[PDB]
Every structure is written in structure tokens, then in C-alpha cells.
Subunit: 106 residues, 3 copies
């Protein structure tokens, strides 16, 4: 898919998590986020289309999705163990990565 | 190792997983599959030898391996906790990732 | 960051792990190693500056950090289980990835 729909998926499944009731709900939301953050890593954002694929920005752009993916991995295991409040707090720390990427490349 | 060898390692250890006697067997095969799926990401597939390494096709190629590695991560954790038939069930689902990539790039 | 600083983060935290007593230290050192190996992945080492970003050596350089990241993953899960010494044993095998890369690209 393209960047905006992947971003949609991230944002909407982030909303599920923040209001989610049970571990199951968080786990399936984080599973869809992980899929969207992977798909998104193959995209060239409008701000860097005229920048090289091997430029420091594209690498840092792609790097940011590696950070997000690993943070989603952490939240996901906590949700799998049932620690629902602990996975949500971790989703809360996720948002800093989101906002850090927008500041730079959106 | 080139693509074909990495594919052979994946094929073999999937077969080990489905005929596996114990969680330990599942765990060692999925580890081999993790190493192979990471190694295969370095290659250009024959169907794309004449495409840019920055083309949408090559990104989706490599992306296919990120999906597989994470599916392997999930099955790996299931086998690490002894859920031998839960790792088998999920190993069944990652076959879909194999077939989809073959359909597109083999 | 630049490679040399990320390498310092890897080396210093690897020490913490080898001398640490409780899982909490190992866990937080492995998390800093995760970020370092992820950020180092952006770099181009002095040995390969004469080489295509798409060269086999460069793919193999970045592959090396994917292996390291995934070995950190397993070590980290062992620390999170409070298995401090199991985690230290896996850090001992992590080192082989460091030296191999050094031998090839440093
Ligand atoms: C870089 C690595 C990013 C990370 C990490 C996250 N986002 Fe993102 N976001 C990014 C870009 C480059 C853009 C703009 C792309 C474009 O084509 O306009 C966005 C945009 C969004 C949007 C807007 C959707 C739209 O219709 O324009 C949303 C709702 C959004 N981002 C959400 C979001 C969330 C919830 C994230 C973390 C969980 C997140 N983004 C991370 C780049 C990056
Ligand atoms: C793309 C992202 C792939 C995924 C995921 C998987 N495979 Fe694959 N496979 C792919 C290509 C491009 C090729 C052709 C390689 C070539 O050089 O011709 C293959 C090939 C195979 C083979 C044949 C190997 C041989 O001896 O020629 C096998 C047995 C195979 N693939 C198995 C396999 C399995 C079991 C997978 C998931 C567990 C899997 N592949 C994923 C591309 C991709
Ligand atoms: C490639 C995939 C590497 C892996 C894996 C590891 N290291 Fe590394 N290291 C690498 C390079 C290319 C270099 C040279 C960097 C430069 O610009 O000079 C290094 C260097 C180091 C250093 C020296 C840092 C300095 O002050 O010059 C240290 C202390 C170091 N590396 C440690 C280290 C450890 C502990 C690793 C595993 C835990 C490891 N490295 C992995 C490339 C690669
Ligand atoms: Cl890209
Ligand atoms: Cl999980
Ligand atoms: Cl491995
Ligand atoms: Cl990619
Ligand atoms: Cl991190
Ligand atoms: Cl790579
Ligand atoms: Na970033
Ligand atoms: Na063959
Ligand atoms: Na061969
Ligand atoms: Na199909
Ligand atoms: Na790099
Ligand atoms: Ni894990």
C-alpha cells in the first residue's frame, strides 16, 4: 500500500490500543501496526522524492520505521503476556517516534 | 550463500518443522530459517536482475523477507515456550508469504 | 550517530552485560545495544566508501547488523526472563558477529 493508508492504519490502530479493553484487542491492533510500519518502509515520502535513495535522509527515514517496528515488538510481547496497562504505556512512548519522523520528513 | 541455497535452507527446515518431534527441533529449524531469510535479502532475484535496486519491485522483494522474518519471530517464540503445535499452525500460515513472493518474483 | 560512536555504545554496554549482576542491568544494556546496532546500520564504513551502496559488500555489511540485532533480540528476551546468565552466555556468542564484521569491513 502507499504511505497515507499505512499511516491511517497506524493511527487508527493506535486509537484502538489507547482505549482497548483487553490484551487480545491490543495484540491484534499492534499486529496491524507492525504490518503497516513494514509496508511503509518501502515508500518514498513526498518531502524526499527528489533526494537520493542512498541519501542520509532516506536511510534515516527507513531507520525510523526500524525503531517503530522494534517498539511495536516490545509492546506486542507485553500484550501477549496480558500486561495490558504496560503495553499501552509502551504504545504511549511509541508516539515520540511517530512525531519525530513527521517533524523531519513530513 | 546465494538465493537458491537460502531457499533450500528454508524449504528443508519448514519440512523439519512439520515433521518435528519436539519444541527443540522446531526451535532449531526456525533459527536456521531466520538466518536464511535474512541472508536472502541480499540477493537480486533472476526475475529482477534487470531492474533498479531502488525500483518498487526490489523494495517489495526485500519487504517480503521482512514479513517472513517477523512471522518466523512469532513461531520462534511459540516453540521457545514449548507450544509445538501452535508453532506448527503459524508455520502453516507463513507458507502464504512464500507462495505470494514466488508468484510475483520467481 | 556516526559508526565510531555507535560502536562505543556497543562496546561499553557489552561490558556492563559481562559484569552485571541483575537482569535489570543486562536488559538496559541490551536495549542500548539494540538502538546502536540499528543506527549504525545507516553508516558506510571507511573500508567500503569506494563501493556501490548496492554492492555485495555493502549488503553484507548491513546484513551483519541484522544478525546482530536479532541476536540482541534473543539475549534481551533471556534477560527479561530474569535469566541473567543465559543472557550473558548469548552475549558471548554475539561477539562472534562483531569480530567477523571487523575482519571483513573494518
Ligand atoms: C517516518 C519513519 C514516520 C513514522 C515513524 C511515522 N510516520 Fe506518520 N507520516 C510520515 C509521513 C512521511 C507522512 C506524510 C506522508 C504523505 O504522503 O503525506 C505521515 C503522515 C501521517 C498521517 C497522515 C495521513 C494522511 O492522510 O496524510 C497520519 C495519520 C500518521 N502519519 C500517523 C502516524 C502514527 C500514528 C505513527 C506512529 C504510530 C506514525 N505516523 C509514524 C512518516 C512517519
Ligand atoms: C520472496 C520474498 C520469497 C520468499 C518470502 C520465499 N521465497 Fe522461495 N524463492 C524466491 C525466489 C525469487 C526464488 C527463485 C530463486 C532462483 O534463484 O531461482 C525462490 C526459490 C525457491 C525454491 C527453489 C530453490 C531451488 O532449488 O531452485 C524453494 C524450494 C523455495 N523457494 C522455498 C521457499 C520457502 C519454503 C519459503 C517460505 C518458508 C520461501 N521460499 C519464501 C523468493 C522467495
Ligand atoms: C559490521 C556489521 C559490524 C558489526 C556487526 C560490529 N561492528 Fe564494530 N566496527 C565496525 C566498523 C566498520 C568499525 C570501524 C568504524 C570506524 O569508523 O572506524 C568498527 C569499530 C569498532 C570499534 C572501534 C570504535 C573506535 O573508536 O574506532 C569498537 C570498540 C567496536 N567496533 C565494537 C563492536 C562490538 C562490541 C560489536 C558487537 C557487540 C561490534 N563492534 C559489531 C563494524 C561492525
Ligand atoms: Cl526506501
Ligand atoms: Cl509476539
Ligand atoms: Cl541467528
Ligand atoms: Cl527495503
Ligand atoms: Cl529501541
Ligand atoms: Cl540488506
Ligand atoms: Na527518526
Ligand atoms: Na536446487
Ligand atoms: Na547454488
Ligand atoms: Na497465492
Ligand atoms: Na549502511
Ligand atoms: Ni521477540
Amino acid at each position: 500500500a502507499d504511505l497515507e493508508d499505512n499511516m491511517e492504519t497506524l493511527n487508527d490502530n493506535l486509537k484502538v490500543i489507547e482505549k482497548a479493553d483487553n490484551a487480545a484487542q491490543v495484540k491484534d491492533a499492534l499486529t496491524k501496526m507492525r504490518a503497516a510500519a513494514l509496508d511503509a518502509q518501502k515508500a518514498t515520502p513526498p518531502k524526499l522524492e527528489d533526494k537520493s535513495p542512498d541519501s542520509p535522509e532516506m536511510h534515516d527515514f527507513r531507520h525510523g520505521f526500524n525503531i517503530l517496528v522494534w517498539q511495536i515488538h516490545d509492546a506486542l510481547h507485553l500484550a501477549n503476556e496480558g500486561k495490558v496497562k504496560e503495553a499501552q504505556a509502551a504504545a504511549e512512548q511509541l508516539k515520540t517516534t511517530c512525531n519525530a519522523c513527521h517533524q523531519k520528513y513530513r
